[PDB]
PDB file of C-alpha atoms and ligand atoms in Angstrom:
ATOM      1  CA  UNK P   1     136.971  69.323 191.190  1.00  0.00           C
ATOM      2  CA  UNK P   2     133.762  67.627 190.071  1.00  0.00           C
ATOM      3  CA  UNK P   3     133.668  65.994 186.624  1.00  0.00           C
ATOM      4  CA  UNK P   4     137.413  66.454 185.939  1.00  0.00           C
ATOM      5  CA  UNK P   5     140.337  64.168 185.113  1.00  0.00           C
ATOM      6  CA  UNK P   6     143.529  63.160 186.891  1.00  0.00           C
ATOM      7  CA  UNK P   7     146.084  65.742 185.768  1.00  0.00           C
ATOM      8  CA  UNK P   8     149.185  63.519 186.029  1.00  0.00           C
ATOM      9  CA  UNK P   9     152.046  64.107 188.432  1.00  0.00           C
ATOM     10  CA  UNK P  10     153.641  67.534 188.169  1.00  0.00           C
ATOM     11  CA  UNK P  11     151.825  68.467 184.959  1.00  0.00           C
ATOM     12  CA  UNK P  12     150.526  71.655 186.626  1.00  0.00           C
ATOM     13  CA  UNK P  13     153.848  72.883 188.004  1.00  0.00           C
ATOM     14  CA  UNK P  14     152.609  76.215 189.460  1.00  0.00           C
ATOM     15  CA  UNK P  15     149.920  74.544 191.617  1.00  0.00           C
ATOM     16  CA  UNK P  16     150.583  74.708 195.363  1.00  0.00           C
ATOM     17  CA  UNK P  17     148.813  73.207 198.372  1.00  0.00           C
ATOM     18  CA  UNK P  18     148.412  75.352 201.466  1.00  0.00           C
ATOM     19  CA  UNK P  19     148.863  73.229 204.575  1.00  0.00           C
ATOM     20  CA  UNK P  20     148.102  73.936 208.223  1.00  0.00           C
ATOM     21  CA  UNK P  21     148.445  70.309 209.358  1.00  0.00           C
ATOM     22  CA  UNK P  22     146.254  69.263 206.427  1.00  0.00           C
ATOM     23  CA  UNK P  23     145.487  70.619 202.929  1.00  0.00           C
ATOM     24  CA  UNK P  24     142.988  73.459 203.142  1.00  0.00           C
ATOM     25  CA  UNK P  25     143.341  75.575 199.942  1.00  0.00           C
ATOM     26  CA  UNK P  26     145.175  75.820 196.683  1.00  0.00           C
ATOM     27  CA  UNK P  27     147.380  78.598 195.339  1.00  0.00           C
ATOM     28  CA  UNK P  28     149.617  79.530 192.461  1.00  0.00           C
ATOM     29  CA  UNK P  29     153.358  80.180 192.424  1.00  0.00           C
ATOM     30  CA  UNK P  30     153.990  83.487 190.610  1.00  0.00           C
ATOM     31  CA  UNK P  31     157.755  83.785 191.199  1.00  0.00           C
ATOM     32  CA  UNK P  32     160.285  81.971 193.351  1.00  0.00           C
ATOM     33  CA  UNK P  33     159.173  83.616 196.582  1.00  0.00           C
ATOM     34  CA  UNK P  34     155.476  84.513 196.201  1.00  0.00           C
ATOM     35  CA  UNK P  35     152.141  82.665 195.989  1.00  0.00           C
ATOM     36  CA  UNK P  36     148.746  84.038 195.148  1.00  0.00           C
ATOM     37  CA  UNK P  37     145.607  82.526 196.688  1.00  0.00           C
ATOM     38  CA  UNK P  38     142.087  83.577 197.811  1.00  0.00           C
ATOM     39  CA  UNK P  39     141.652  85.954 200.728  1.00  0.00           C
ATOM     40  CA  UNK P  40     139.006  83.611 202.150  1.00  0.00           C
ATOM     41  CA  UNK P  41     141.817  81.049 202.603  1.00  0.00           C
ATOM     42  CA  UNK P  42     143.661  83.280 205.083  1.00  0.00           C
ATOM     43  CA  UNK P  43     144.874  81.820 208.326  1.00  0.00           C
ATOM     44  CA  UNK P  44     148.002  82.017 210.437  1.00  0.00           C
ATOM     45  CA  UNK P  45     150.535  79.216 210.300  1.00  0.00           C
ATOM     46  CA  UNK P  46     150.709  78.332 206.598  1.00  0.00           C
ATOM     47  CA  UNK P  47     153.210  75.909 205.073  1.00  0.00           C
ATOM     48  CA  UNK P  48     153.302  76.069 201.286  1.00  0.00           C
ATOM     49  CA  UNK P  49     153.715  72.704 199.571  1.00  0.00           C
ATOM     50  CA  UNK P  50     155.196  72.779 196.044  1.00  0.00           C
ATOM     51  CA  UNK P  51     155.791  69.932 193.626  1.00  0.00           C
ATOM     52  CA  UNK P  52     152.891  67.878 194.972  1.00  0.00           C
ATOM     53  CA  UNK P  53     150.836  65.210 193.315  1.00  0.00           C
ATOM     54  CA  UNK P  54     149.614  62.849 196.033  1.00  0.00           C
ATOM     55  CA  UNK P  55     149.324  65.096 199.093  1.00  0.00           C
ATOM     56  CA  UNK P  56     149.442  62.088 201.447  1.00  0.00           C
ATOM     57  CA  UNK P  57     152.617  60.436 200.152  1.00  0.00           C
ATOM     58  CA  UNK P  58     156.159  61.817 199.787  1.00  0.00           C
ATOM     59  CA  UNK P  59     156.923  61.091 196.113  1.00  0.00           C
ATOM     60  CA  UNK P  60     160.243  62.968 195.773  1.00  0.00           C
ATOM     61  CA  UNK P  61     159.555  66.320 194.031  1.00  0.00           C
ATOM     62  CA  UNK P  62     158.090  68.238 196.953  1.00  0.00           C
ATOM     63  CA  UNK P  63     159.391  71.436 198.487  1.00  0.00           C
ATOM     64  CA  UNK P  64     157.877  72.437 201.794  1.00  0.00           C
ATOM     65  CA  UNK P  65     158.405  76.128 202.700  1.00  0.00           C
ATOM     66  CA  UNK P  66     156.723  78.084 205.457  1.00  0.00           C
ATOM     67  CA  UNK P  67     155.138  81.496 204.865  1.00  0.00           C
ATOM     68  CA  UNK P  68     156.856  84.583 206.281  1.00  0.00           C
ATOM     69  CA  UNK P  69     154.008  86.977 205.672  1.00  0.00           C
ATOM     70  CA  UNK P  70     150.499  87.059 204.247  1.00  0.00           C
ATOM     71  CA  UNK P  71     148.863  90.110 202.668  1.00  0.00           C
ATOM     72  CA  UNK P  72     145.075  90.057 202.195  1.00  0.00           C
ATOM     73  CA  UNK P  73     143.819  92.604 199.628  1.00  0.00           C
ATOM     74  CA  UNK P  74     143.116  95.940 201.279  1.00  0.00           C
ATOM     75  CA  UNK P  75     139.496  95.950 200.083  1.00  0.00           C
ATOM     76  CA  UNK P  76     138.519  92.316 200.673  1.00  0.00           C
ATOM     77  CA  UNK P  77     134.913  91.958 201.802  1.00  0.00           C
ATOM     78  CA  UNK P  78     134.260  88.589 203.431  1.00  0.00           C
ATOM     79  CA  UNK P  79     130.439  89.005 203.157  1.00  0.00           C
ATOM     80  CA  UNK P  80     130.394  89.540 199.327  1.00  0.00           C
ATOM     81  CA  UNK P  81     133.734  87.987 198.482  1.00  0.00           C
ATOM     82  CA  UNK P  82     134.684  91.016 196.449  1.00  0.00           C
ATOM     83  CA  UNK P  83     138.452  91.306 196.103  1.00  0.00           C
ATOM     84  CA  UNK P  84     138.995  87.645 197.116  1.00  0.00           C
ATOM     85  CA  UNK P  85     142.771  87.628 196.652  1.00  0.00           C
ATOM     86  CA  UNK P  86     145.778  87.241 198.956  1.00  0.00           C
ATOM     87  CA  UNK P  87     149.589  87.173 198.519  1.00  0.00           C
ATOM     88  CA  UNK P  88     151.859  84.867 200.548  1.00  0.00           C
ATOM     89  CA  UNK P  89     155.634  85.359 200.772  1.00  0.00           C
ATOM     90  CA  UNK P  90     157.781  82.317 201.289  1.00  0.00           C
ATOM     91  CA  UNK P  91     160.522  82.312 203.945  1.00  0.00           C
ATOM     92  CA  UNK P  92     163.031  81.185 201.300  1.00  0.00           C
ATOM     93  CA  UNK P  93     162.935  80.996 197.547  1.00  0.00           C
ATOM     94  CA  UNK P  94     161.733  77.813 195.855  1.00  0.00           C
ATOM     95  CA  UNK P  95     164.044  75.951 193.537  1.00  0.00           C
ATOM     96  CA  UNK P  96     162.455  76.219 190.076  1.00  0.00           C
ATOM     97  CA  UNK P  97     162.646  73.260 187.631  1.00  0.00           C
ATOM     98  CA  UNK P  98     160.324  71.612 185.083  1.00  0.00           C
ATOM     99  CA  UNK P  99     158.098  70.232 187.911  1.00  0.00           C
ATOM    100  CA  UNK P 100     158.026  73.405 190.051  1.00  0.00           C
ATOM    101  CA  UNK P 101     157.544  76.532 188.041  1.00  0.00           C
ATOM    102  CA  UNK P 102     155.906  79.923 188.179  1.00  0.00           C
ATOM    103  CA  UNK P 103     152.896  80.979 186.178  1.00  0.00           C
ATOM    104  CA  UNK P 104     152.874  84.370 184.405  1.00  0.00           C
ATOM    105  CA  UNK P 105     150.529  87.184 185.305  1.00  0.00           C
ATOM    106  CA  UNK P 106     148.287  88.373 182.492  1.00  0.00           C
ATOM    107  CA  UNK P 107     148.814  91.482 180.506  1.00  0.00           C
ATOM    108  CA  UNK P 108     145.211  91.581 179.289  1.00  0.00           C
ATOM    109  CA  UNK P 109     141.953  90.221 180.605  1.00  0.00           C
ATOM    110  CA  UNK P 110     140.638  87.093 178.981  1.00  0.00           C
ATOM    111  CA  UNK P 111     137.399  87.188 176.981  1.00  0.00           C
ATOM    112  CA  UNK P 112     134.287  85.085 177.365  1.00  0.00           C
ATOM    113  CA  UNK P 113     134.645  81.828 175.360  1.00  0.00           C
ATOM    114  CA  UNK P 114     138.321  81.373 176.194  1.00  0.00           C
ATOM    115  CA  UNK P 115     139.115  77.840 177.437  1.00  0.00           C
ATOM    116  CA  UNK P 116     140.965  77.540 180.680  1.00  0.00           C
ATOM    117  CA  UNK P 117     142.433  74.902 183.027  1.00  0.00           C
ATOM    118  CA  UNK P 118     141.259  74.708 186.651  1.00  0.00           C
ATOM    119  CA  UNK P 119     142.963  72.377 189.126  1.00  0.00           C
ATOM    120  CA  UNK P 120     142.851  71.273 192.733  1.00  0.00           C
ATOM    121  CA  UNK P 121     142.520  68.663 195.470  1.00  0.00           C
ATOM    122  CA  UNK P 122     138.957  69.544 196.395  1.00  0.00           C
ATOM    123  CA  UNK P 123     135.845  67.439 196.676  1.00  0.00           C
ATOM    124  CA  UNK P 124     134.932  65.431 193.605  1.00  0.00           C
ATOM    125  CA  UNK P 125     131.201  64.951 194.396  1.00  0.00           C
ATOM    126  CA  UNK P 126     128.257  67.360 193.975  1.00  0.00           C
ATOM    127  CA  UNK P 127     126.300  65.352 196.576  1.00  0.00           C
ATOM    128  CA  UNK P 128     128.291  63.876 199.388  1.00  0.00           C
ATOM    129  CA  UNK P 129     132.023  63.983 199.911  1.00  0.00           C
ATOM    130  CA  UNK P 130     135.066  62.278 198.421  1.00  0.00           C
ATOM    131  CA  UNK P 131     138.445  63.997 198.569  1.00  0.00           C
ATOM    132  CA  UNK P 132     140.932  62.580 195.958  1.00  0.00           C
ATOM    133  CA  UNK P 133     144.536  62.929 197.157  1.00  0.00           C
ATOM    134  CA  UNK P 134     146.009  63.348 193.637  1.00  0.00           C
ATOM    135  CA  UNK P 135     145.580  66.558 191.646  1.00  0.00           C
ATOM    136  CA  UNK P 136     142.467  66.867 189.450  1.00  0.00           C
ATOM    137  CA  UNK P 137     142.038  69.030 186.361  1.00  0.00           C
ATOM    138  CA  UNK P 138     139.105  70.538 184.488  1.00  0.00           C
ATOM    139  CA  UNK P 139     138.978  72.354 181.160  1.00  0.00           C
ATOM    140  CA  UNK P 140     136.210  74.971 181.196  1.00  0.00           C
ATOM    141  CA  UNK P 141     135.285  78.151 179.283  1.00  0.00           C
ATOM    142  CA  UNK P 142     134.835  81.635 180.638  1.00  0.00           C
ATOM    143  CA  UNK P 143     131.196  82.563 180.490  1.00  0.00           C
ATOM    144  CA  UNK P 144     129.774  85.885 179.327  1.00  0.00           C
ATOM    145  CA  UNK P 145     129.222  88.514 182.000  1.00  0.00           C
ATOM    146  CA  UNK P 146     125.533  88.582 181.085  1.00  0.00           C
ATOM    147  CA  UNK P 147     125.189  84.812 181.691  1.00  0.00           C
ATOM    148  CA  UNK P 148     127.104  85.130 184.958  1.00  0.00           C
ATOM    149  CA  UNK P 149     124.954  88.010 186.235  1.00  0.00           C
ATOM    150  CA  UNK P 150     121.785  86.143 185.243  1.00  0.00           C
ATOM    151  CA  UNK P 151     122.883  83.119 187.216  1.00  0.00           C
ATOM    152  CA  UNK P 152     123.742  85.196 190.360  1.00  0.00           C
ATOM    153  CA  UNK P 153     121.533  88.304 190.430  1.00  0.00           C
ATOM    154  CA  UNK P 154     122.895  91.063 192.566  1.00  0.00           C
ATOM    155  CA  UNK P 155     126.162  89.267 193.353  1.00  0.00           C
ATOM    156  CA  UNK P 156     128.688  89.622 190.517  1.00  0.00           C
ATOM    157  CA  UNK P 157     131.119  92.574 190.695  1.00  0.00           C
ATOM    158  CA  UNK P 158     133.607  93.752 188.100  1.00  0.00           C
ATOM    159  CA  UNK P 159     136.269  91.778 189.983  1.00  0.00           C
ATOM    160  CA  UNK P 160     134.618  88.388 189.288  1.00  0.00           C
ATOM    161  CA  UNK P 161     133.925  86.140 186.299  1.00  0.00           C
ATOM    162  CA  UNK P 162     132.044  82.916 185.889  1.00  0.00           C
ATOM    163  CA  UNK P 163     133.550  79.793 184.244  1.00  0.00           C
ATOM    164  CA  UNK P 164     132.122  76.344 183.721  1.00  0.00           C
ATOM    165  CA  UNK P 165     128.990  74.849 182.312  1.00  0.00           C
ATOM    166  CA  UNK P 166     125.435  76.048 182.824  1.00  0.00           C
ATOM    167  CA  UNK P 167     124.181  72.499 182.402  1.00  0.00           C
ATOM    168  CA  UNK P 168     126.082  71.475 185.574  1.00  0.00           C
ATOM    169  CA  UNK P 169     128.162  68.407 186.163  1.00  0.00           C
ATOM    170  CA  UNK P 170     131.656  69.978 185.949  1.00  0.00           C
ATOM    171  CA  UNK P 171     132.944  72.600 188.455  1.00  0.00           C
ATOM    172  CA  UNK P 172     135.437  73.409 191.129  1.00  0.00           C
ATOM    173  CA  UNK P 173     134.383  72.526 194.688  1.00  0.00           C
ATOM    174  CA  UNK P 174     135.269  72.742 198.396  1.00  0.00           C
ATOM    175  CA  UNK P 175     139.007  72.492 198.906  1.00  0.00           C
ATOM    176  CA  UNK P 176     139.806  73.899 195.429  1.00  0.00           C
ATOM    177  CA  UNK P 177     139.545  77.461 196.767  1.00  0.00           C
ATOM    178  CA  UNK P 178     142.512  79.661 196.103  1.00  0.00           C
ATOM    179  CA  UNK P 179     143.723  77.588 193.172  1.00  0.00           C
ATOM    180  CA  UNK P 180     144.445  78.604 189.597  1.00  0.00           C
ATOM    181  CA  UNK P 181     142.441  79.283 186.491  1.00  0.00           C
ATOM    182  CA  UNK P 182     144.998  79.359 183.667  1.00  0.00           C
ATOM    183  CA  UNK P 183     144.089  80.471 180.119  1.00  0.00           C
ATOM    184  CA  UNK P 184     146.583  80.711 177.281  1.00  0.00           C
ATOM    185  CA  UNK P 185     149.477  80.220 179.718  1.00  0.00           C
ATOM    186  CA  UNK P 186     148.507  83.087 182.040  1.00  0.00           C
ATOM    187  CA  UNK P 187     146.877  83.169 185.468  1.00  0.00           C
ATOM    188  CA  UNK P 188     143.414  84.702 184.820  1.00  0.00           C
ATOM    189  CA  UNK P 189     141.399  83.479 187.875  1.00  0.00           C
ATOM    190  CA  UNK P 190     141.423  82.315 191.419  1.00  0.00           C
ATOM    191  CA  UNK P 191     138.860  79.732 192.662  1.00  0.00           C
ATOM    192  CA  UNK P 192     136.544  81.839 194.835  1.00  0.00           C
ATOM    193  CA  UNK P 193     132.876  80.854 195.319  1.00  0.00           C
ATOM    194  CA  UNK P 194     129.707  79.321 193.956  1.00  0.00           C
ATOM    195  CA  UNK P 195     126.462  77.792 195.112  1.00  0.00           C
ATOM    196  CA  UNK P 196     127.060  74.148 195.928  1.00  0.00           C
ATOM    197  CA  UNK P 197     129.209  72.439 193.237  1.00  0.00           C
ATOM    198  CA  UNK P 198     128.370  71.507 189.671  1.00  0.00           C
ATOM    199  CA  UNK P 199     124.678  72.459 189.981  1.00  0.00           C
ATOM    200  CA  UNK P 200     122.631  73.496 186.972  1.00  0.00           C
ATOM    201  CA  UNK P 201     122.632  77.237 186.291  1.00  0.00           C
ATOM    202  CA  UNK P 202     125.185  77.825 189.094  1.00  0.00           C
ATOM    203  CA  UNK P 203     128.656  78.027 187.537  1.00  0.00           C
ATOM    204  CA  UNK P 204     131.769  78.716 189.518  1.00  0.00           C
ATOM    205  CA  UNK P 205     132.769  82.289 190.294  1.00  0.00           C
ATOM    206  CA  UNK P 206     136.437  83.294 190.115  1.00  0.00           C
ATOM    207  CA  UNK P 207     138.484  86.324 191.124  1.00  0.00           C
ATOM    208  CA  UNK P 208     139.438  88.340 188.023  1.00  0.00           C
ATOM    209  CA  UNK P 209     143.242  88.463 188.348  1.00  0.00           C
ATOM    210  CA  UNK P 210     143.801  90.941 185.509  1.00  0.00           C
ATOM    211  CA  UNK P 211     142.301  93.662 187.713  1.00  0.00           C
ATOM    212  CA  UNK P 212     144.983  93.092 190.386  1.00  0.00           C
ATOM    213  CA  UNK P 213     148.258  92.994 188.413  1.00  0.00           C
ATOM    214  CA  UNK P 214     149.327  96.533 189.472  1.00  0.00           C
ATOM    215  CA  UNK P 215     148.633  95.765 193.124  1.00  0.00           C
ATOM    216  CA  UNK P 216     150.468  92.426 192.949  1.00  0.00           C
ATOM    217  CA  UNK P 217     153.542  93.993 191.269  1.00  0.00           C
ATOM    218  CA  UNK P 218     153.682  96.943 193.642  1.00  0.00           C
ATOM    219  CA  UNK P 219     153.272  94.776 196.714  1.00  0.00           C
ATOM    220  CA  UNK P 220     156.014  92.298 195.697  1.00  0.00           C
ATOM    221  CA  UNK P 221     158.372  95.159 194.898  1.00  0.00           C
ATOM    222  CA  UNK P 222     157.998  96.560 198.439  1.00  0.00           C
ATOM    223  CA  UNK P 223     157.809  93.440 200.631  1.00  0.00           C
TER     224      UNK P 223
HETATM  225  N1  MRZ U 301     132.964  76.598 192.043  1.00  0.00           N
HETATM  226  C1  MRZ U 301     132.286  76.369 193.160  1.00  0.00           C
HETATM  227  N2  MRZ U 301     131.102  75.831 193.041  1.00  0.00           N
HETATM  228  N3  MRZ U 301     132.818  76.655 194.340  1.00  0.00           N
HETATM  229  C2  MRZ U 301     134.102  77.311 194.544  1.00  0.00           C
HETATM  230  C3  MRZ U 301     134.929  76.598 195.572  1.00  0.00           C
HETATM  231  C4  MRZ U 301     134.156  76.442 196.844  1.00  0.00           C
HETATM  232  C5  MRZ U 301     132.776  75.838 196.660  1.00  0.00           C
HETATM  233  C6  MRZ U 301     132.019  76.613 195.608  1.00  0.00           C
HETATM  234 CA1   CA U 302     153.408  64.277 197.985  1.00  0.00          CA
END
């Protein structure tokens, strides 16, 4: 996250870190046994880390649970990033409390102008590299589809939305991928792609979760 603030320990209780020896992507806990992330974060050998603040120090609220299966969306396209969404089942259920909690799925799609919270452990610089260790947060609005399509001609599908600031300076960045965009207490987006980080006229692009609720619910019910 570029241009954000330190969230505070366990203030984003649905945020997870995906670990394969190191943090590589975020995700969101949607019930006691399932996480949603980005398809472009897929790899074998995932440990899900819940209850994290500092990802390099054991602070006492963590739960570390390995994945039993991963399900990439059936129509994910790695060239265009259309349908950039993946479900991860935990080998055992997490123990839910005030510091480790699920986030609700939306029952309607959020409108442009809605303010949302984006979080992650990704790079904090638009030029160069500095990875922060504690969780960072950013408040940002959803942008109109017309603004989004004008920023990225020929690239925005109905399964994507833009959020952030056209003036630049505040955005998600590398290592935030897969993490949550929460608006009015519901998971509306997944950190997906963008050109660089925090550049003028290049806002972040997010997977539009409200289009996937039926697939999520059906998949969980059957796996
Ligand atoms: N929001 C931006 N700029 N991103 C998404 C996360 C990876 C880098 C590009
Ligand atoms: Ca920790």
